[PDB]
Structure 1
Amino acid sequence: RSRAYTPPEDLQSRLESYVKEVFLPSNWQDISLEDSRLKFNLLAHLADDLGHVVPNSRLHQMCRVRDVLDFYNVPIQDRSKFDELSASNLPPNLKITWSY
């Protein structure tokens, strides 16, 4: 259970496969998620699979399948600032310590 997310490379076909398995026509990226059961099944399958869930703050924002598609291909990367600074390719005269 770690908030790091790295989007898959077969995400188009997986997501499309889930859209067919919840249903199916062409132009499937413009399917409205107005039906609430359809949205719950689609995002519940994706959360079960990818381990990455659409938050409550964004859950109303996807009204098409394309928006879920655009959500599941942002890399949410989670580590401490000590691990972000020390990995940002420091010059040889910066030294950072964490008295924590």
Structure 2
Amino acid sequence: VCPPLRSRAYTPPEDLQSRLESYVKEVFLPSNWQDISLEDSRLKFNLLAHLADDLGHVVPNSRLHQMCRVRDVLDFYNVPIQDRSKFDELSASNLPPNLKITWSY
């Protein structure tokens, strides 16, 4: 009944531009579509909800007001997020042979 816990790990797709273009066209057409304002709540909600369900990653509450234009949305979705433990982060930092790290947790 309870879905498995989702990783925060997100890698920006190469074809992100085309995806965003199509979704903007669907939700809203004008030239310089990057400069389309999201002042209207209905349109903004629709766009962001679609992108969240499709990409599996959502804009946080803190960053919502910052999403003034479509350009800002594009900027946000081209930023990678890595979800891994600190132990994993240290291990995959290309450690020299003399350095050894253990985790007792």
Give the TM-score normalised by the residue count of structure 1: 0.99
Unaligned runs of 5+ in 2: 1-5
Q: Please report how far the alpha carbon of residue 85 of structure 1 lies from its aligned counterpart in structure 2 after TM superposition.
A: 0.3
Q: Deviations over 1:38-87 (max 9, x none)?
A: 00000000001000000001000010000000000100111000000000
State the secondary structure of the residue aligned to 1:95: strand
For 2:20 and 2:94, locate their aligned partners in 1 and report how far apart those are by CA, in whole Å. 36
For 2:35 and 2:44, locate their aligned partners in 1 and report how far apart those are by CA, in whole Å. 14
Identify which of 66, 69, 81 aligns with 2:86. Answer: 81
Q: Deviations over 1:23-49 (max 9, x none)?
A: 211100000000000000000000010
For 1:64 and 1:4, locate their aligned partners in 2 and report how far apart those are by CA, in whole Å. 25
What RMSD in Å do the two structures reach over aligned CA positions? 0.4
For 2:88 and 2:44, locate their aligned partners in 1 and report how far apart those are by CA, in whole Å. 36
For 1:47 and 1:24, locate their aligned partners in 2 and report how far apart those are by CA, in whole Å. 22
For 1:84 and 1:41, locate their aligned partners in 2 and report how far apart those are by CA, in whole Å. 36
Structure 1 consecutive aligned stretches of length 4 or more whose deviation exceeds 6 Å: none
For 1:93 and 1:16, locate their aligned partners in 2 and report how far apart those are by CA, in whole Å. 51
- Aligned position for 2:67: 62
For 2:52 and 2:40, locate their aligned partners in 1 and report how far apart those are by CA, in whole Å. 18
Question: How many aligned positions are there?
Answer: 100
State the secondary structure of the residue aligned to 2:62: coil
Q: Please report how far the alpha carbon of residue 20 of structure 1 lies from its aligned counterpart in structure 2 after TM superposition.
A: 0.2
Give the TM-score normalised by the residue count of structure 2: 0.94
